[PDB]
Design a protein around this ligand. Structure first.
Ligand code: NA
Ligand code: NA
Length: 327
DNA sequence: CATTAGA
DNA sequence: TCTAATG
């Protein structure tokens, strides 16, 4: 957590590279595991050799630790940090819709910057376009005060369309968070479950609504189960227009909401922990269900959930307000 | 780890 | 159909 810091940070840097700038999946996967084990270990790696002891810790990585250990640096890092081609990749990549693959491609054509990409709007697709045209606000954070803003509206049309809908803005907002990146609404309707072969309309109904009135302003992607998009709070009585904000609406068989709800809300650790616990408590929690463990090694059989509560009772735990679902 | 674009 | 990008 701190005795291995320099390591694990130098290494990840290392890994993050091969996977992007370069296509070296393997080497990339390697530094990660390495960065992984070297971080576990309880002592101060005083030398690569002592490190080398560890699994994944080959001659390659060890050498690296030695030079980082000896001098406050590492050239390969100092070189990469410098690399303008690389450097670029790293950045275009910020464009929602640009990934590593498209990064290299653009760069190899010569687009390496914001403007570069403007002049080549044609060279972008709808997604990457909106991504372009929204470059700034996509980076911008979202105040809770704003979360709480949009939340309101959303649940309004939701209810206005069909009173039988259920929506819940999940995430860290869900967990109290003084600010957030995007809105995660989980949605479900009783008239849709495990079997009841769809009703794409259910999802398609609401997107229309929100859109109608003004919330949704863009289409990033829409499928019969998950809609991807943009939104903007109405710009008041002027002098202040709200900026553009990512949004994700997703359908759900009412017979799997609670776990779905439990889960997305996290925290990544809270889940992991409560999840580890059900194992003892003779269970198995995972994204849409909770099944009873059968000694043979494994079992199945989805227990019935009506609330975040059933899940808790089942594993015989304390209902944890989302607020403190922190870990 | 799954759902969408798009080519 | 695959392959990229998101989450
Ligand atoms: Na070893
Ligand atoms: Na991106």
């Amino acid at each position: 957590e701190t005795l291995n810091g320099g390591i694990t940070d130098m290494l990840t840097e290392l890994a993050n590279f091969e996977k992007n700038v370069s296509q070296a999946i393997h080497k990339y996967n390697a530094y990660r595991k390495a960065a992984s084990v070297i971080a576990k270990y309880p002592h101060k790696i005083k030398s690569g050799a002592e490190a080398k002891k560890l699994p994944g810790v080959g001659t390659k990585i060890a050498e690296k630790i030695d030079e980082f250990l000896a001098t406050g640096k590492l050239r390969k890092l100092e070189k990469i940090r410098q690399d303008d081609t690389s450097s670029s990749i790293n950045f275009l990549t910020r464009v929602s819709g640009i990934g590593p693959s498209a990064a290299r491609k653009f760069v190899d054509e010569g687009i390496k910057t914001l403007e570069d990409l403007r002049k080549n709007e044609d060279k972008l697709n709808h997604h990457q376009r909106i991504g372009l045209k929204y470059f700034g606000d996509f980076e911008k954070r979202i105040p809770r005060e704003e979360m709480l803003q949009m939340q309101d509206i959303v649940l309004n049309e939701v209810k206005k369309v069909d009173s039988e809908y259920i929506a819940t803005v999940c995430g860290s907002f869900r967990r109290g968070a003084e600010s957030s990146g995007d809105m995660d609404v989980l949605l479900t309707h009783p008239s849709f479950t495990s079997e009841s072969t769809k009703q794409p309309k259910l999802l398609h109904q609401v997107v229309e609504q929100l859109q109608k009135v003004h919330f949704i302003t863009d289409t990033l992607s829409k499928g019969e189960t998950k809609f991807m998009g943009v939104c903007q709070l109405p710009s008041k009585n002027d002098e202040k227009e709200y900026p553009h904000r990512r949004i994700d609406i997703r359908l759900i068989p009412k017979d799997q909401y609670y776990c779905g709800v439990l889960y997305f809300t996290g925290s990544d650790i809270f889940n992991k922990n409560m999840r580890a616990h059900a194992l003892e408590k003779g269970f198995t929690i995972n994204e849409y269900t909770i099944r009873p463990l059968g000694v043979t090694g494994v079992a199945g059989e989805p227990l019935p959930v009506d609330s975040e509560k059933d899940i808790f009772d089942y594993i015989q735990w304390k209902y944890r307000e989302p607020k403190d679902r922190s870990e």
